[PDB]
Design a protein around this nucleic acid. Structure first.
Ligand SMILES: [Zn+2]
Ligand SMILES: [Zn+2]
Ligand SMILES: [Zn+2]
Lengths: 370, 1181, 114
RNA sequence: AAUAAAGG
């Protein structure tokens, strides 16, 4: 039960979901096809195991990326509930942070254990990569923010909030970032120096999500406060541009889309809301269908209208923007609550880390299954 | 610190995408309007000379055409074309009969961000449909907004938009839309699927697709639904409106055929038998048929039947068996024939059919009858050379031993064209190389004439010289006939044939004489005040002009020459003239005779003969206007010729001071005057450094045309199709005398002087076709060619190709192969097998029995000619052919690969003197996805690492690796550096150190971008990186460490952009011909065109930029598009000119040139210096 | 495109001048990092200016066997690790699973069995 | 060497 890597176990033919055949097929289809109006349709039969192209191979159908096929479940030996899961920027492998402060590095092809590290002294809550793929930035519970390099080395550790930090994000130039705390404030920080530019003091209590914007300088935050749940900020200035009364319960997550037009938020009143970031007087639409709360949301990295979400009950559902009803989903994906979701940089594997001490891998379906 | 460059279109694109059959020119005949990316061709169907298609008109746009339709408006006398361009642009254009060009009737922009509903990226192309009764048109923009355009009973009305998803039964995911036949109001049938699914999720949801008939009322903007249907099979692909009196739609789905109408249950029929557990629709099996209807084209050839071109080529003839009241009862298939991989399809005159193709040669077919079977026959083909997947640059095999010993190299481009059954190798050259049969050395001579004596084989070579002349007998061996009836005493000014070659006339500056072999019949002296200087023969007329401007005419009446003086009393001295024996029918007011005369006061005139009546005049001729019109700079030469099929197309060639001007005659319509006008023609011939410079030949190898002599010689050819072909010939030097020749050594050949006093008797190398934008040879492989590599030391072409077979097994986890077992009606999968062939540039036929088959399921992902170190050569290096292979079993099998290093060696045999030497063939611990070389090492990309191998004693040895991005799929090195390209991340610049054996990332472009290929813009002591993307954009990035946003040098800064408008997958580059170490960078687009970037100076770039702005803002453009918004991306840097626009300056009269150069401030001489120098620097291949 | 037709060897580039002189380079912002960097030429010729915090790879010592973590790209002791960061399969550590027991389970075992 | 074997 020790596991130092010296135990002499026999071989195993690992259950693999590989992307290289599909990419090769796509590179060969490019040269003789204009777009998906020149694509010969895949059949729903078991012998078409080579006619699959990755999500880039087809943009007229996001439905492919609805990952409801189980692959592999990655559980440590000294279990803890998983809080945040992030593919390294090149999809090389996957990192899990758990309530013991440890990083567990999993392969991204066969999905096996690679290594484990004692990172924080406290339950790790936040984990995100810079837009240049160089710096990883982590935050634990009731404490620090730490700087990580691609080889998982720690170069600078810095106290930020006297209370627990819940989320973070980078500036499109990655030179400055944000941290929202359990102290009810959003602190905007410099990077190369660990220097604090601004403090943002608009919320009532317990800012529990924050996110910068891909191009503009507007920082969004979300709280418990029933009076100012979602707020906007200008980083250099520090002024509340607006306030957004959308959810009557603690707004868990908040997500800005890469096209810069869309906000998506998820709250304990069972709902997800899509907002047109310029016209905040109304609700662009209401994603309904979650028998309990919603806890995690993630946009697909290739398709622009597709996202996934997971709730307090183990469900994880897949939604599309122009589409009303739920697009797909899996009801008992976990047992506990899904804390974190992560798409693969290529968009065919989805990792979901939950409160039942595990993390599960999902992939696309095979043609003509049961 | 930036890099400037011109773009040029070295070869127009070839693949056609749309076809249509409409009244383009007028309401008398109908003809074929075909389109491409940015090109439009109106062809005229001939029925003689054996059917061929004559190119009637051709236009190009500053915009990729995304759809095309035709309409017959209210009071119009021709059909208007409704064209569709990027994201929303509906442009309605027409034919301009008074100027023989294309007029823009209207332009509609529907591009407002309110219409996109939030999404920034557009994947839904415009689609334009027209009502059969020409009462409205529709355009589906952004996949949501249905634009409706009525036409008046100005024939246009205010368009209006419809939210297609605001209608009852909210639409989503529209498949295809059509208008029906037989409704009192226009009716759009929309096929869509509200709840979308996937072939991996048909077990979870199916029967998704539906149809709606939206009856559009255009008078009061109402449009209800009349009938809808749901639960149709999930993979409906296409809709076909059925003409009367059957009247409904025929819906194609990948596995079934559906017919739908009012008051009729859907009559559906399942074709193959993969409809098991994937549709709950009632589908009745089609018995003797086992096919799939995806990617298939279809057209009705009568009210009852239609023709279908499948995804693979097979042409079937479906028949709609009916009842007594034309309610479709059952169907009937019938496998008629096989053909090309179509991409469009249209029915011409009853009996003909055009199959348009961007994957092979487009084909005109004919079908005759013999409930009916139709047999098909290829009547004609239009050449296509795309998509240009890959290109090798190899040297031709034979060069006449006089053309060697020359500094400029001799090069040739082999290109992997086509796909599938239509995969070929296209061999392209640009110039002509005359095959020099023999050479003489005749100094002193400066002119020649080749005359027929007594079946039309040439007799005497009437040469000419300074004070005397010379004559060669030339029946069997070129022997100087002397002491003949001809005049050797003086310098000859003309020699020809009159009376169906039965006679000769030798015109000298003292008189004319007519001959019948060696002996002369007649001699009449000519004195009128001045010596003769000009002479032009049109059988049976002879007109001679004097050194001062008098004119006199002769003819052969029944037997010698008769004198006549033309009554052309006028006050302006004459400068030039010509005669024209018209065999066509255009010059009206059957042969007739015409005299084109030019005077001193600018004017030009055309007389009819023998009466010398005036029928056509032009006021200001030497200027070079763009349409010559009947009115109520030293012109040096003028020639009017008839070319084409049976002398059908007359051109007018003009040599003005330093300029060539080419006009083509087109018809038009004071009264009693010539019913013709002359439209100018664009070209790139340069006349910059009393004998003729234009040389008419007919049948020099089978072709009619003209040779333009001078410092830059050219061949002007026209063939059965009126496609004008302008081919350079500069291998020899500046040609200065030419003659069509036909002997026993040069059968259908020619002969010419260069400027070192040398005659050359030559013939055209009879292995290329010269009726193409470049001289091309096509080489069909009957399979698919992926990679092509010219192996140097052997002078051979290694070609990696593939072929499809059925599929039988399925791999598993200990690698079981679960064999597929279905019923009889099961459409098996397709499975590729690769083969690496050798091909010889001598016969262009594959070397027999030198072919490497590769292991089953083993794709080849790359093949290059790498030069790897070895202790066997002088330069320590030597070229091999490497190929990396991926053994792609399936999604759930750990994809491995293998590296394969071959050599091509010499062995005792004709063609069997070369074989493969597989020097290395070994499995690598990961997929092999791209490779190159770097100072003698094999740089391989295995999985997600990049390795640098050393081949020592024939075994690869690792020396350095590096960790890299998702999927490298392209690598190119220069001088110790490497440049990796990725499938979703843009690019990275790497490096190697022989000393420490360490790769290292120099820098990288941190943004995301989907690269196709990458190369180097090489400039003097600079080096950019040229990248092409998924969005048809080229982009130049640089490594600028002191740039304050290339932080530590760790970023690549986009220093230039350009929107080429076409996907490029392959680059190459050659030096020049100010240009010291600048290299031209060529590329081939996946549409069949060739292009080039040339690095420039900033000083020149600024001048030409001012001119470019002036041209784009002061001139009209075809279909209204503007050439500034078309060269924009999708921040933008734009240090690249257009080239395709600058040449329009060359197409302006000198008045307009002067105006514009003054409104810039510069001088047209400096303008033309810049432009024409850019032209002469890129004259390769 | 080929080394015969378009030969860029007689030329010097702006890169080749801004690479062997380390022209655009700032010192490291945090101490302890540098795999995927130039082996510093100045430190070879005893002229290292950035003083230990050089942005490029120092090679002070001599090393014998390949670094076991470096092969996976997870070494934290960079520029100061005891083990080679060079890809030379003849200086790879010995297989534990073979040296102790006597049967390696890796068919493609990169470790020296002996 | 700091988990190479983490299908225990
Ligand atoms: Zn140093
Ligand atoms: Zn190390
Ligand atoms: Zn071992």
């Amino acid at each position: 039960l020790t596991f130092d890597g010296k135990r002499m176990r026999k071989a195993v033919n690992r259950k693999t979901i590989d992307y290289n055949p599909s990419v090769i097929k796509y590179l060969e289809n490019r040269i003789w096809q204009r777009d998906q109006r020149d694509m010969r349709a895949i059949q729903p039969d078991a012998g078409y195991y080579n006619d699959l192209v990755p999500p880039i191979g087809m943009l007229n159908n996001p439905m492919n990326a609805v990952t409801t096929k189980f692959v592999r479940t990655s559980t440590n030996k000294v279990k803890c509930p998983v809080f945040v899961v992030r593919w390294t920027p090149e999809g090389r492998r996957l990192v899990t942070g758990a309530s013991s402060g440890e990083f567990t590095l999993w392969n991204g092809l066969t999905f096996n254990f690679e290594t484990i590290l004692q990172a924080h002294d406290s339950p790790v809550r936040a984990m995100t990569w810079s837009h240049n793929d160089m710096w990883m930035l982590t935050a634990d519970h009731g404490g620090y923010v730490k700087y990580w390099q691609s080889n998982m080395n720690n170069v600078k550790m810095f106290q930020a909030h006297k209370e627990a930090i819940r989320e973070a994000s980078f500036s499109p130039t990655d030179n400055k970032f944000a941290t929202c705390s359990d102290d009810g404030t959003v602190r905007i920080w410099d990077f190369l120096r660990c220097h604090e530019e601004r403090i943002l003091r608009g919320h009532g209590a317990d800012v529990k999500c924050v996110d910068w914007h891909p191009t503009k300088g507007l920082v969004v935050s979300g709280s418990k406060d029933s009076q100012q749940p979602i707020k906007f900020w200008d980083p250099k200035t520090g002024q509340s541009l607006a306030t957004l009364h959308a959810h009557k319960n603690t707004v868990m997550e908040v997500k800005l889309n890469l096209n810069g037009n869309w906000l998506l938020t998820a709250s304990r009143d069972h709902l997800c809301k899509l907002f047109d970031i310029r016209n905040l007087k109304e609700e662009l639409q209401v994603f309904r269908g979650h028998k309990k709360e919603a806890t995690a949301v993630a946009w697909h990295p290739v398709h622009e209208g597709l996202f996934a979400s997971g709730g307090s009950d183990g469900s994880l559902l897949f939604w599309h923007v122009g589409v009303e009803k739920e697009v797909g989903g899996m009801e008992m994906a976990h047992e506990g609550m899904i804390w974190s979701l992560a798409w693969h940089p290529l968009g065919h594997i989805l990792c979901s880390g939950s409160n039942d001490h595990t993390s599960k891998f999902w992939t696309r379906n095979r043609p003509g299954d049961k | 610190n930036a890099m400037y460059a011109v773009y040029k279109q070295a070869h127009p694109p070839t693949g056609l995408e749309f076809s249509m059959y409409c009244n383009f020119f007028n309401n008398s005949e109908r003809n074929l309007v075909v389109a491409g990316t940015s090109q439009l061709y109106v062809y005229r169907l001939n029925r003689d000379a054996r059917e061929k298609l004559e190119l009637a008109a051709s236009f190009s746009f500053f915009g990729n055409v995304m759809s095309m339709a035709s309409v017959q408006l209210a009071g119009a006398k021709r059909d208007a074309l409704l064209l569709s361009f990027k994201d929303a642009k509906l442009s309605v254009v027409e034919y301009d009969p008074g100027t023989h060009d294309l007029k823009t009737l209207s332009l509609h922009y529907f591009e407002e961000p309110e219409l996109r509903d939030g999404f920034v990226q557009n994947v839904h192309t415009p689609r334009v449909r027209v009502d059969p009764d020409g009462r409205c048109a529709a355009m589906l923009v952004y996949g949501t907004r249905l634009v409706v355009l009525p036409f008046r009973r100005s024939s246009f009305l205010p368009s209006y938009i419809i939210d297609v998803r605001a209608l009852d039964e909210k639409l989503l995911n529209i498949i295809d839309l059509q208008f029906l036949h037989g409704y009192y109001e226009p009716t759009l049938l929309i096929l869509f699927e509200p709840n979308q699914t996937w072939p991996g999720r048909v077990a979870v949801r199916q029967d998704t697709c539906s149809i709606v008939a939206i009856s559009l009322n255009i008078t009061q903007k109402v449009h209800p639904v009349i009938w809808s249907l749901t639960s149709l099979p999930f993979d409906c692909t296409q809709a076909l409106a059925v003409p009367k009196p059957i009247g409904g739609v025929v819906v194609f789905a990948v596995n079934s055929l559906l017919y739908l109408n009012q008051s009729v249950p859907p009559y559906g029929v399942a074709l193959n038998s993969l409809t098991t557990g994937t549709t709950a629709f009632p589908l009745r099996t089609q018995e003797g048929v086992r096919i799939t209807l995806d990617c298939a084209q279809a057209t009705f050839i009568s009210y009852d039947k239609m023709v279908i071109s499948l995804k693979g080529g097979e042409i079937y003839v479906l028949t709609l068996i009916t009842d007594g009241m034309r309610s479709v009862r059952a169907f009937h298939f019938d496998k008629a024939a096989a053909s090309v991989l179509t991409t469009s399809m249209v029915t011409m005159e009853p009996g003909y059919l055009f199959l348009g193709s961007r994957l092979g040669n487009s084909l005109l077919l004919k079908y005759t009858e013999k409930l009916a079977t139709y047999s098909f026959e290829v009547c004609d083909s239009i050449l296509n050379i795309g998509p240009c997947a890959n290109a090798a640059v190899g040297e031709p095999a034979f060069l006449s031993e006089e053309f060697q010993n020359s500094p400029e190299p001799d090069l040739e481009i082999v290109v992997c064209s086509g796909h599938g059954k239509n995969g070929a190798l296209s061999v392209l050259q640009k110039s002509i190389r005359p095959q020099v049969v023999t050479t003489f050395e005749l100094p002193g001579c400066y002119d020649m004439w080749t005359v027929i004596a007594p079946g039309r084989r040439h007799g005497f070579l009437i040469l000419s010289r300074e004070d005397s002349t010379m004559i060669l007998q030339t029946g069997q061996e070129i022997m100087e006939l002397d002491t003949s009836g001809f005049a050797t005493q003086g310098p000859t000014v003309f020699a020809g044939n009159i009376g169906d070659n039965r006679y000769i006339v030798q015109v000298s500056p003292l008189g004319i004489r007519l001959l019948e072999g060696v002996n002369q019949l007649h001699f009449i002296p000519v004195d009128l005040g001045a010596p003769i200087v000009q002479c032009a023969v049109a059988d049976p007329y002879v007109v001679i002009m004097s050194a001062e401007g008098h004119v006199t005419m002769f003819l052969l009446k029944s037997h010698r020459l008769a004198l006549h003086k033309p009554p052309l009393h006028h006050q302006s001295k004459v400068i030039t003239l010509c005669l024209y024996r018209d065999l066509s029918g255009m010059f009206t007011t059957e042969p007739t005779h015409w005299c084109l005369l030019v005077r001193e006061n600018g004017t030009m005139e055309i007389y009819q003969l023998p009466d010398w009546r005036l029928v056509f005049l032009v006021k200001n001729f030497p200027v070079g206007q763009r349409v010559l019109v009947d009115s109520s700079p030293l012109v040096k030469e003028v020639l009017l010729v008839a070319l084409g099929s049976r002398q059908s197309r007359p051109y007018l060639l003009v040599h003005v001071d330093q300029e060539l001007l080419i006009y083509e005659a087109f018809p038009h319509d004071g009264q009693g005057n010539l019913k013709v006008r002359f439209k100018k023609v664009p070209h790139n011939i340069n006349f910059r450094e009393r004998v003729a410079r234009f040389r008419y030949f007919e049948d020099i190898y089978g072709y009619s045309g003209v040779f333009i002599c001078g410092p830059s010689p050219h061949w002007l050819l026209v063939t059965g199709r009126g496609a004008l072909r302008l081919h350079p010939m500069a291998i020899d030097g500046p040609v200065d005398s030419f003659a069509p020749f036909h002997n026993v050594n040069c059968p259908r050949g020619f002969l010419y002087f260069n400027r070192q006093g040398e005659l050359r008797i030559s013939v055209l190398p009879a292995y290329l076709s010269y009726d193409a934008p470049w001289p091309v040879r096509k080489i069909p492989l009957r399979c698919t060619a992926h990679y092509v590599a010219y192996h140097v030391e052997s002078k051979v072409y290694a070609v990696a190709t593939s072929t499809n077979t059925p599929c039988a097994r399925i791999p598993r986890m200990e690698k079981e192969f679960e064999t597929i077992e279905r019923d009889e009606r099961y459409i098996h999968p397709q499975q590729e097998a690769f083969s690496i062939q050798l091909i010889s540039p001598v016969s262009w036929e594959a070397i027999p029995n030198a072919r490497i088959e590769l292991q089953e399921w083993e794709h080849v992902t790359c093949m290059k000619t790498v030069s790897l170190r070895s202790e066997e050569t002088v330069s320590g290096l030597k070229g091999y052919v490497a190929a990396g292979t991926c053994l792609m079993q399936g999604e759930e099998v750990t994809c491995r690969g293998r590296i394969l290093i071959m050599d091509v060696i010499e062995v005792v045999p004709p063609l069997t003197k070369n074989k493969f030497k597989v020097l290395y063939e070994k499995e690598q611990k990961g997929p092999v996805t791209a490779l190159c070389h770097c100072n003698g090492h094999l740089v391989s990309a295995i999985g997600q690492k990049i390795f640098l191998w050393s081949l020592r004693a024939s075994e690869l040895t690792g020396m350095a690796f590096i960790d890299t991005q998702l999927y490298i799929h392209q690598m190119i090195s220069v001088k110790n550096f490497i440049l990796a390209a990725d499938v979703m991340k843009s690019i990275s610049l790497l490096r190697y150190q022989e000393e420490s054996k360490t790769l290292s990332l120099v820098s990288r472009d941190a943004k995301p971008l989907e690269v196709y290929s990458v190369d180097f813009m090489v400039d003097n002591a600079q080096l950019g990186f040229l990248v092409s993307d998924r969005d048809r954009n080229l982009m130049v990035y640089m490594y600028l460490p002191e740039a304050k946003e290339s932080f530590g040098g760790m970023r690549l800064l986009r220093r230039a952009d350009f929107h080429v408008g076409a996907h490029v997958n392959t680059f190459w580059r050659t030096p020049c011909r100010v240009w010291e170490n600048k290299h031209i960078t060529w590329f081939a687009t996946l549409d069949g065109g060739i292009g080039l970037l040339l690095p420039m100076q900033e000083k020149t770039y600024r001048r030409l930029l001012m001119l470019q702005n002036a041209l784009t803002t002061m001139l009209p453009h075809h279909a209204g598009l503007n050439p500034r918004a078309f060269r924009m991306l999708h921040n933008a840097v734009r240090n690249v000119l257009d080239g395709e626009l600058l040449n329009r300056y060359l197409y302006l009269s000198t008045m307009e040139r002067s105006e514009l150069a003054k409104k810039i401030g510069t001088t047209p001489d400096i303008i033309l210096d810049d432009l024409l120098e850019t032209d002469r620097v890129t004259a390769h291949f | 495109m080929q080394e015969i037709i378009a030969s860029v060897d007689h030329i010097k580039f702006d890169l080749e001048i801004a690479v062997e002189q380390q022209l655009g380079a700032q010192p490291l912002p945090f101490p302890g990092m540098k795999s995927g960097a130039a082996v510093c030429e100045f430190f070879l010729k005893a002229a290292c200016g950035k003083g230990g915090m050089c942005p490029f790879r120092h090679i002070s010592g001599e090393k014998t066997v390949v670094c076991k973590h470096w092969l996976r790209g997870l070494c934290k002791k960079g520029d100061q690790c005891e083990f080679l960061h060079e890809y030379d399969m003849t200086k790879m550590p010995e297989c534990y699973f073979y040296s102790k027991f006597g049967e390696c389970s890796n068919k493609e075992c990169p470790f020296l069995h002996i």
